[PDB]
């Protein structure tokens, strides 16, 4: 059992900020569809796509209504008539009830809680993060970083195991576990993995070696991995548990800053229930 | 062993800066680098990413890996070598070279001037001296070493690309 939590930078963690909108209950529902189409070619509302325009909700005993977004309130979000906001005849109010206020999540949510918080006030785009065909293959992916940690473990070494891969294709670039020895100490399994998807790379090549690519690590990246990552630009990263010197999450989120030149997203909890049994990075 | 290496700082810059511009010359970033264990150098390194098309190696990624082969080649312990050596860089360390010295528990780094991009001795982030447990040592900085020169073969660079 296992769930993908983002890890964004700080700023986008907590709540979207609101911002004030008309709406109008359709007291008339089989003018629904007319009424959209009229109204959201006069408002368009370009810079909120993530916003379904009807409402529904449920009555205290199934009865469903529907109230229809208008428009963003102006500077002075006073009470507004159907009059003095929907302009005829581009639009035939016949259906509408009385305008009201109502709070938007000003843009989309990204975590769960957001999108809890988002839907409270408004439907709002995305339920779930990943379909089913994905958190297959996400699984199938990190199984693989798994089994890379364990054969480091039988073999005396870090249990530390990742896998890059290529999401155009679904194909698996690199996998490698964690390698460090009294000789090479930093040889941690990201360093590894970096190393072996550059070695089987082109010779017009640049040195961004993960442009594009998904890595799937078993626990987090320490800030030397980390910062390699950024380096080469990987594009998205996967990870099971945490580590207590992370730099994806926990002590840094060196993917989301704004004054490095590169940023990717990140998701820990792939199998956490496995991963947290294996060992932290460093 | 450690404070007779600073006696040659001069020297040792010197070497890194001429090792810089050579980089500066074939299309890197100019960082040049130098490890030196009881006043002598024991691995140089100036940055290959674009001549080997791998991001990680850095200048000093690159002078790690040649202590490294000189310890396994003279059969002496990593630890009782990089414990008393001091990194002499043209360019603040970045973030992911601050860590691996860190790893590598290298005490002392001369370094000319900061480096604003990706500096992780206290520009972007405070990784050699950051409160990291598990993250090898904190490591000390004596930094602006002949920076003025150093920070104008990193302009060059830039504005070349
Ligand atoms: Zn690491
Ligand atoms: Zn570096």
Same mark, same amino acid.
């Given at each position: 059992?296992?769930? %993908?939590?983002? !890890?964004?930078?700080?700023?986008?963690?907590?709540? !979207?900020?609101?911002?004030?909108?008309?709406?109008?209950?359709?007291?008339?529902?089989?003018?629904?569809?007319?009424?959209?189409?009229?109204?959201?070619?006069?408002?368009?509302?370009?810079?909120?796509?993530?916003?379904?325009? !009807?409402?529904?909700?449920?009555?205290?005993?199934?009865?469903?209504?529907?109230?229809?977004?208008?428009?963003?309130?102006?500077?002075?979000?006073?009470?507004?008539?159907?009059?003095?906001?929907?302009?005829?005849?581009? !639009?035939?109010?016949?259906?509408?009830?009385?305008?009201?206020?109502?709070?938007?999540? %000003?843009?989309?949510?990204?975590?769960?809680?957001?999108?809890?918080?988002? @839907?409270?006030?408004?439907?709002?785009?995305?339920?779930?993060?990943?379909?089913?065909?994905?958190?297959?293959?996400?699984?199938?992916?990190?199984?693989?970083?798994?089994?890379?940690?364990?054969?480091?473990?039988?073999?005396?070494?870090? %249990?530390?195991?990742?896998?890059?891969?290529?999401?155009?294709?679904?194909?698996?670039?690199?996998?490698?576990?964690?390698?460090?020895?009294?000789?090479?100490?930093?040889?941690?399994?990201?360093?590894?993995?970096?190393?072996?998807?550059?070695?089987?790379?082109?010779?017009?090549?640049?040195?961004?070696?993960?442009?594009?690519?998904?890595?799937?690590?078993? @626990?987090?990246?320490?800030?030397?991995? %980390?910062?390699?990552?950024?380096?080469?630009?990987?594009?998205?990263?996967?990870?099971?548990?945490?580590?207590?010197?992370?730099?994806?999450?926990?002590?840094?989120?060196?993917?989301?800053?704004?004054?490095?030149?590169?940023?990717?997203?990140?998701?820990?909890?792939?199998?956490?229930?496995?991963?947290?049994?294996?060992?932290?990075?460093? | 062993?450690?404070?007779?290496?600073?006696?040659?700082?001069?020297?040792?810059?010197?070497?890194?800066?001429?090792?810089?511009?050579?980089?500066?010359?074939?299309?890197?970033?100019?960082?040049?680098?130098?490890?030196? #264990?009881?006043?002598?150098?024991?691995?140089?390194?100036?940055?290959?990413?674009?001549?080997?098309?791998?991001?990680?190696?850095?200048?000093?990624?690159?002078?790690?890996?040649?202590?490294?082969?000189?310890?396994?080649?003279?059969?002496?312990?990593?630890?009782?070598?990089?414990?008393?050596?001091?990194? #002499?860089?043209?360019?603040?360390?970045?973030?992911?070279?601050?860590?691996?010295?860190?790893?590598?528990?290298?005490?002392?780094?001369?370094?000319?001037?900061?480096?604003?991009?990706?500096?992780?001795?206290?520009?972007?982030?405070?990784?050699?001296?950051?409160?990291?447990?598990?993250?090898?040592?904190?490591?000390?900085?004596?930094?602006? #070493?002949?920076?003025?020169?150093?920070?104008?073969?990193?302009?060059?660079? #830039?504005?070349?690309?």
């Amino acid at each position: 059992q296992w769930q %993908a939590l983002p !890890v964004l930078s700080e700023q986008q963690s907590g709540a !979207v900020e609101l911002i004030l909108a008309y709406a109008a209950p359709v007291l008339d529902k089989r003018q629904t569809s007319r009424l959209l189409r009229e109204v959201s070619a006069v408002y368009p509302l370009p810079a909120q796509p993530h916003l379904k325009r !009807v409402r529904p909700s449920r009555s205290a005993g199934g009865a469903q209504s529907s109230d229809l977004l208008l428009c963003l309130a102006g500077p002075s979000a006073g009470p507004r008539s159907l009059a003095e906001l929907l302009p005829r005849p581009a !639009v035939d109010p016949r259906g509408l009830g009385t305008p009201f206020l109502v709070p938007l999540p %000003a843009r989309p949510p990204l975590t769960r809680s957001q999108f809890e918080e988002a @839907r409270a006030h408004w439907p709002t785009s995305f339920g779930q993060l990943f379909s089913t065909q994905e958190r297959a293959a996400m699984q199938t992916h990190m199984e693989r970083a798994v089994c890379a940690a364990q054969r480091a473990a039988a073999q005396g070494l870090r %249990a530390v195991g990742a896998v890059v891969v290529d999401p155009a294709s679904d194909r698996v670039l690199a996998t490698g576990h964690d390698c460090s020895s009294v000789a090479s100490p930093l040889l941690h399994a990201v360093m590894v993995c970096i190393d072996l998807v550059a070695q089987g790379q082109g010779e017009d090549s640049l040195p961004y070696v993960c442009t594009g690519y998904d890595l799937y690590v078993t @626990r987090e990246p320490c800030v030397m991995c %980390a910062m390699a990552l950024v380096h080469a630009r990987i594009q998205r990263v996967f990870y099971g548990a945490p580590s207590p010197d992370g730099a994806l999450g926990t002590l840094f989120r060196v993917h989301a800053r704004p004054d490095l030149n590169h940023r990717f997203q990140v998701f820990r909890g792939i199998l956490e229930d496995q991963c947290r049994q294996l060992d932290p990075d460093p | 062993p450690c404070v007779v290496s600073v006696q040659e700082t001069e020297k040792w810059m010197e070497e890194a800066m001429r090792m810089a511009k050579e980089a500066l010359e074939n299309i890197e970033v100019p960082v040049g680098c130098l490890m030196v #264990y009881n006043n002598e150098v024991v691995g140089k390194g100036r940055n290959e990413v674009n001549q080997t098309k791998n991001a990680t190696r850095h200048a000093e990624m690159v002078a790690i890996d040649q202590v490294l082969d000189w310890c396994h080649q003279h059969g002496q312990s990593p630890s009782t070598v990089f414990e008393h050596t001091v990194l #002499y860089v043209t360019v603040e360390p970045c973030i992911m070279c601050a860590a691996a010295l860190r790893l590598m528990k290298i005490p002392l780094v001369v370094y000319g001037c900061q480096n604003e991009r990706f500096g992780g001795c206290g520009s972007v982030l405070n990784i050699a001296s950051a409160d990291l447990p598990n993250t090898g040592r904190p490591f000390q900085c004596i930094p602006g #070493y002949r920076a003025e020169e150093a920070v104008e073969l990193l302009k060059t660079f #830039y504005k070349q690309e």
